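Quick sanity check, Glycosyltransferase:
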Amino acid sequence: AFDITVVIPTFKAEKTVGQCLESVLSQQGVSTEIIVVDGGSPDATISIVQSFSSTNLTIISEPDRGIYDAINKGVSRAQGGMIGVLGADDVYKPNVLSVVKENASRGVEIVAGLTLIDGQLRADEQYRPAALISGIPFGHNAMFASQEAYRKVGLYDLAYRICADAEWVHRAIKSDISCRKVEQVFVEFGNPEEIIAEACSVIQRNFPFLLKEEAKYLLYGVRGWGETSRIEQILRKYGHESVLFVTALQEAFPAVETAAALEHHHHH
Ligand SMILES: C[C@@H]1O[C@H](OP(=O)(O)OP(=O)(O)OC[C@H]2O[C@@H](n3cnc4c(=O)[nH]c(N)nc43)[C@H](O)[C@@H]2O)[C@@H](O)[C@H](O)[C@@H]1O
C-alpha cells in the first residue's frame, strides 16, 4: 500500500526524534509508512512523534528486549514495498526515498546506499562472499530491504546486541538475496572487546570451523587493521570445508588466487 516503510526504534529519544522524523516526512515522490517502536520512553518522545503528520504513522509503545527486538516488531508490521530502519539520531538525505523506489523498480531485494559519519564516508565493502569474513558491508541505516527479502532471511537475532545487523546481511548473502548498491549518501549521523567478540561470533556463524582468533585475523586482515601473511595458511587449513569460504578469501585477498585455485581443484 506504501512504497516505503521506515521503522524507527526509540527509547528516550526526545533530543533528536523530531529531526529524524522531519527527514522522513519531508521525503517527496513516495508514499511512506512510518512505524515508531518505542520501548516505553518517559520523556517527550511520544508527544514529539505525535507532533508530526500521523496519517501514515503508527506508534508502538511498550517494553521490549532492546533495539533489535523493536526493529523486529516494526519489520513484522511493515506494509511498504521496501523497508528501512532509521535510528532517532540519524537522518535520511533529501530525495533518498524516491531514489530507493526508482532503484527498486526492477525487483532487486535490497537497495543500499552510502553513509556519512562525522562528515566522512563509511568505508563500505562489496556485498559478496568476501563480506562473510568481515562485518556489515554497508551501513544498516542506509539499507532498504523488500518484504520478500525479510520473508526469506527472517528476523534479527536477538543474541547479537551489537552486530545483529551484520549477521542479518550475512544471512542475506548466504541466501543469494539480490542487492543494488547506490553510490549516493542515504543517511547521515554523528566496549571494543564486546564488539570484536560479537563480530568474530558472526563470522563463525558463517564458517563454524574457524577458531575465534582465526575469525579475528580474517576480519582484521580484510579491514586493513592487521597483517595477512597467515591467510594462505588459513586457506590451506580449511579450504576443504567450504567452497564459499575459499570464494570469500579469494575475493577479499585476490593475491591468494593461485592458492585458492588449488583448493578448488582438489576439493570443489
Ligand atoms: C537502529 C540501530 O541502531 C544501532 O546503533 P546503536 O549505537 O546500537 O543504538 P543507539 O544509536 O544508541 O540507538 C538506536 C536507536 O534505538 C533506540 N533505542 C535504544 N535502545 C532501545 C531499546 O531498548 N528499545 C527501543 N525500542 N529502542 C531503543 C534509540 O532511541 C535510538 O533511536 C545500529 O548499529 C543498527 O545498525 C541500527 O541502526
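Posting the structure with no commentary besides this: Residues 194-267 form one domain.
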